[PDB]
Ligand binder design. Structure first.
Ligand SMILES: Nc1ncnc2c1ncn2[C@@H]1O[C@H](COP(=O)(O)OP(=O)(O)NP(=O)(O)O)[C@@H](O)[C@H]1O
Ligand SMILES: Nc1ncnc2c1ncn2[C@@H]1O[C@H](COP(=O)(O)OP(=O)(O)O)[C@@H](O)[C@H]1O
Ligand SMILES: Nc1ncnc2c1ncn2[C@@H]1O[C@H](COP(=O)(O)OP(=O)(O)O)[C@@H](O)[C@H]1O
Lengths: 370, 74, 370, 370
């Protein structure tokens, strides 16, 4: 009996260890109303969470507590965990031990405060933090190979050989799904369709998920998109109003491969994977080329694998064979790894108990990382 | 002055600028021996020193046994 | 053609016309068309059904005001063509659009269709020899006579902050908010109705604007002026009737610095300035704080600079010199900038000929914009 | 030749240039080419797309920094040639390259292709009368005024130790490692991200270099100070923001003594010095321990002499006199040596003439260079 709770900046995937899919999946967001001194009606909650905040977008100011995979507002983060445990899962944190997920090369303060809250506030019997990239290997049952776990906050590439990580080869990029949404809003406004407010930002994100796809040849696709109006598709808003996205449809995801558009002054996601392999040992490079895994929900763009294959192949040697591993279920690949690891009898020893926390302190999390 | 004197929508008898008040080790270690560099003295010491550059070739050529560049200062 | 260029400031409130040789804009009139309130089918009534500038001022009570431009965007193009035809009339300037070139002042981050359609009018409706659209923020710096400087241009339709260093405009740090002078007049009309003075007619909206322009002071401490009993300063209407403004005078513009009070989802005028500087590189941030320039008409409010300096100082880093160098002619700065730019020999290369527009197409205006 | 020879110290961090006989290098500027990343909009703005030396230092925020040479190996030759052109320009020496002979000072055990191409430029692009390339270690001895001594020259790009006895150099006992000052700056940046301070931009990396120089001490016992709670020493950034460096001050520079921290299979700086001596003949080993000369900027860390002497004493034989000598002008020692050697009449015979290069070619440089 154990709980797996992924602390994603976009979506919170929670469930019991051994389960195939997460039980409770909701957006990690807090919505507080823009209330004036004028009297309000009955059934009014001071702060809404998840589906409720998504339903009442009109009045509620939506503030993500996690910014670039870092918890900015810890008080709101506790309210997300409180809704997750008590309301969504319908389980006491005192009963089951909780498996948590961290991004690589995160600030040390996150682990320190994380463990304090779970043991002190929630009084959990045990808590273990795991690397998202390491868990995704358990989902694929592969000890060797690199993973490109691209989230809403950040994107990172962690190469692991025969279940041994190369810490020097780990690369972190702040470019992620949330930055793409803000880019799409700007270029849609230039077309004519203006989106300013927090509620409108969420509507544009829902539009992005439906229409946007990755082009194989960016210049040729834009040249063809300029010529013909076959790619131009219509989208119906919550209001009767209908919009035509046009050439901007496939323009948004290009920023991942060419960050110069957003102005990141960094290398593309395909260059990050290649650069990481170059930092890795010469012998194991062959196996990393053979096992390039794509993880997270930011790699669910249609035809991203086709563009990735072309770009990596160009960078890689001509003699070398480059194989990209893109399973249908990438979105829940990190959580499934957590469920498999938590289910494994070996992991039973890895749990940090309340007694161990009290004796050692919050510094115990830093010792039992890797 | 006459330019904005004619115009109606101009600031008159107001301050132009709104601004805030103007607000006004290893080389000294004991373990290492500290040397003062005097290039004039160094030149005088090495001034009359010469080298023999005849037959000079530092390169990784195998032929003709071992070589030592700069034979003498004769 | 060698003939002097005609500068036209595309202000949502008042259009400012004149030649590049002129030191000041000679012709400044409200940017709206006045039509009779009653729909006139019979003869012996007001003929033409178009009153612009002083003609509208003469028959103000009889006519109904409709602004063709909202938040720096043209809604009714037919009305705007009549206004631009009035710019090239016998009444104002009295010159041929075929002889003299034109310099336009388009707001930043507008839809591409608005820019393309605006250009089409001056080439198709008007047979202009040459046309050049320029950036409002850049022109303000030519007027002031400095290359480096932050330009906080608070207009009637739009408020935007552009940081420019050594004649380089950072496109990523630019911030635009729709809450401008026009909204304060709308909010004051609401507050005046809360005082017990109704302004039902569109003509009475101009009297709310007149009250704001005459009597509107920004308090340093709003709680002391709210607690203190007001003098209740009377304003005299053209008819002779008096209005007691009272606390509505100073507690109306508060929404510029605190728009969350009424319930408008925006940062605020003091916030947009600070954030725009924070986006820039660490090396330039200190120079941008030491060089701030106020532009637009919504800076003429009594005690604006005093309140702004205090609000910026609290947000800005400690022990940093903050110099807000306001000119006396903030309202007319943008047009003077255009006159200077047009006067420069570099402009000769900048503008696009009518013949080039006929051959190249519409795209021409986008490539030469920057 | 009547025209004085030009000394060019091609360092990874800063290039030191001047004429032979000069007491100190007159012209010292950073070794990188800065290109403007932001768009030029205004007329009268900064001219040129290339900024080198004090112009790049003044307007750093606008520019993107790019080092042409890494570990004493020219990566981009086009950029390196332009910097050598800058040395001769009106801002720097302001002299003709064809009139003055040149003295180049490269690091030991560099690739032959680098030396060959570097020389080609000074005979083909520049019509130099004669070129002589010299070793860094040999020049340091002319500055100190000693024929016998071990020269541990830890630079920004490369760290090497060359034992030389009474003028004689043992080429087989020379030890070279790529890890140098620039790697510690990158390694410190890793700790700043872990503490929670982001410095992504090429300009922000130069601030990290300034932070390293200001606040970093070398611990006598690393494990002791690592465990003990560190005082959070505050540093003020150019904009005004304060950062707490804390334990990263001493944990970052440790890389010099422990290359396993980054994960490179190389010897520590303390092992390089002793190992280089141990390779030398049994008779001379005691004299080489007696005559140890420190050089390079990477020895300027507080407690370098104390830590090095402790590490050398442990590795060195028992009952041996270990005297470590530090010139007061550690940074300028290499250049001063060049000026002293260049001023000598024996230097005339050492030259490779333009005519000699044209006849023999690349062979002449390999034959006459050491
Ligand atoms: N089918 C799709 N098409 C386009 N974009 C998508 C698609 N699916 C996901 N995304 C983008 O990817 C982002 C994150 O994916 P998501 O499905 O939230 O996985 P996630 O693991 O919850 N991310 P995180 O919140 O960091 O855990 C979304 O916010 C979208 O921008
Ligand atoms: N003296 C004043 N005091 C207060 N508000 C003023 C004053 N003069 C003008 N305004 C406000 O500013 C507006 C003028 O904006 P303006 O500077 O003409 O914009 P633009 O730069 O687009 O031409 C008016 O409509 C009014 O709302
Ligand atoms: N006070 C200091 N403390 C620590 N490191 C320093 C200090 N001053 C300079 N450095 C380091 O030394 C470098 C200078 O290297 P330098 O000796 O000039 O190179 P080279 O010998 O290759 O010409 C700087 O870039 C920096 O990394």
């Amino acid at each position: 009996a154990a709980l797996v709770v992924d602390n994603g900046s976009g979506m919170c995937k929670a469930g019991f260890a051994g389960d195939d899919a997460p039980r409770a999946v909701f957006p990690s967001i807090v919505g507080r109303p823009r209330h004036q001194g004028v009297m309000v009606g009955m059934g009014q909650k001071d702060s809404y969470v998840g589906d409720e905040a998504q339903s009442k977008r009109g009045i509620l100011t939506l503030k993500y507590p996690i910014e670039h995979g870092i918890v900015t507002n810890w008080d709101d983060m506790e309210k997300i965990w409180h809704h997750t445990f008590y309301n969504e899962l319908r389980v006491a944190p005192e009963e089951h031990p909780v498996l948590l997920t961290e991004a690589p090369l995160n600030p040390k303060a996150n682990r320190e405060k994380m463990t304090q809250i779970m043991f002190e506030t929630f009084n959990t019997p045990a808590m273990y933090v795991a690397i998202q990239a390491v868990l995704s290997l358990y989902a694929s049952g592969r000890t060797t190979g690199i993973v490109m776990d691209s989230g809403d906050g950040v994107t990172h590439t962690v190469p692991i050989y025969e279940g041994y990580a190369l810490p020097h080869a780990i690369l972190r990029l702040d470019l992620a799904g949330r930055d793409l949404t803000d880019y799409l809003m700007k270029i849609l406004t230039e077309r004519g369709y203006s989106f300013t407010t927090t509620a409108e930002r969420e509507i544009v994100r829902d539009i992005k998920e439906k229409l946007c796809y990755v082009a194989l040849d960016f210049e040729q696709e834009m040249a063809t998109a300029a010529s013909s109006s076959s790619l131009e598709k219509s989208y119906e808003l919550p209001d009767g109003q209908v919009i035509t996205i046009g050439n901007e449809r496939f323009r948004c995801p290009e920023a991942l491969f060419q960050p110069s558009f957003l102005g990141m002054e960094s290398c593309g996601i395909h260059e990050t994977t290649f650069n990481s392999i170059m930092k890795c040992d010469v012998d194991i490079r062959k196996d990393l080329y053979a096992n390039t895994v794509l993880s997270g929900g930011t790699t669910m763009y249609p035809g991203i694998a086709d563009r990735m294959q072309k770009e990596i192949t160009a960078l890689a040697p001509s003699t070398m064979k480059i194989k990209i591993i893109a399973p249908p279920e990438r979105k829940y690949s990190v959580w499934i790894g957590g469920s498999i690891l938590a289910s494994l009898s070996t992991f039973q020893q890895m749990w940090i108990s309340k007694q161990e926390y009290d004796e050692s302190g919050p510094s115990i999390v830093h010792r039992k990382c890797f | 002055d006459p330019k904005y004197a004619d115009l109606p929508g101009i600031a008159r008898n107001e301050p132009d600028v709104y601004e805030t008040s103007d607000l006004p080790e290893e080389l000294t270690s004991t373990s290492v021996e500290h040397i003062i560099v005097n290039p004039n003295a160094a030149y005088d010491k090495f001034k009359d020193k010469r080298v023999g550059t005849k037959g000079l070739d530092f390169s990784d050529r195998i032929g003709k046994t071992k070589r030592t560049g700069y034979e003498s200062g004769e | 053609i060698a003939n002097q260029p005609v500068v036209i400031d595309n202000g949502s409130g008042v259009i400012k016309a004149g030649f590049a040789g002129d030191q000041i804009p000679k012709y400044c009139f409200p940017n709206y068309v006045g039509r009779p309130k009653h729909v006139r089918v019979m003869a012996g009534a007001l003929e033409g059904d178009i009153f612009i500038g002083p003609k509208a001022e003469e028959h103000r009570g009889l006519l109904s005001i409709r602004y063709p431009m909202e938040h720096g965007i043209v809604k009714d193009w037919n009305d705007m063509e009549r206004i631009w035809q009035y710019v090239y009339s016998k009444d104002q300037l009295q010159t041929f659009s075929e002889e003299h070139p034109v310099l336009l002042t388009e707001a930043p981050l507008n839809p591409r269709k608005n820019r393309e359609r605006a250009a089409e009018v001056f080439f198709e409706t008007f047979n202009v020899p040459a046309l050049f659209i320029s950036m409002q923020a850049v022109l303000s710096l030519y007027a002031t006579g400095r290359t480096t400087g932050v330009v906080l241009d608070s207009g009637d339709g739009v408020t935007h902050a552009v940081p420019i260093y050594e004649g380089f405009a950072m496109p990523h740090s630019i911030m635009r908010i729709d809450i401008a002078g026009r909204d304060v007049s709308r909010f004051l009309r609401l507050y005046l109705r809360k005082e017990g003075y109704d302004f039902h007619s569109s003509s009475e909206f101009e009297i709310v604007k007149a009250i704001k322009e005459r009597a509107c002071y920004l308090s340093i401490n709003p709680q002391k002026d709210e607690t203190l009993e007001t003098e209740k300063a009377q304003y005299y209407l053209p008819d002779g009737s008096t209005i007691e403004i009272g606390p509505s005078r100073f507690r109306a513009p508060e929404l510029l610095f605190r728009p969350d009070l009424i319930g408008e989802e925006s940062e605020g005028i003091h916030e947009v300035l600070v954030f725009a500087i924070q986006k820039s590189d660490m090396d330039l941030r200190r120079t941008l704080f030491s060089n701030i320039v106020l532009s637009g008409g919504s800076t003429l409010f009594k005690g604006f600079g005093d309140r702004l300096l205090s609000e910026v100082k609290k947000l800005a880093p400690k022990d940093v010199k903050i110099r807000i160098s306001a000119p006396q002619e903030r309202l007319y700065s943008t047009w003077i900038g255009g006159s200077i730019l047009a006067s420069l020999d570099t402009f000769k290369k900048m503008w696009v000929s009518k013949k080039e527009y006929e051959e190249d197409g519409a795209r021409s205006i986008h490539r030469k914009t920057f």
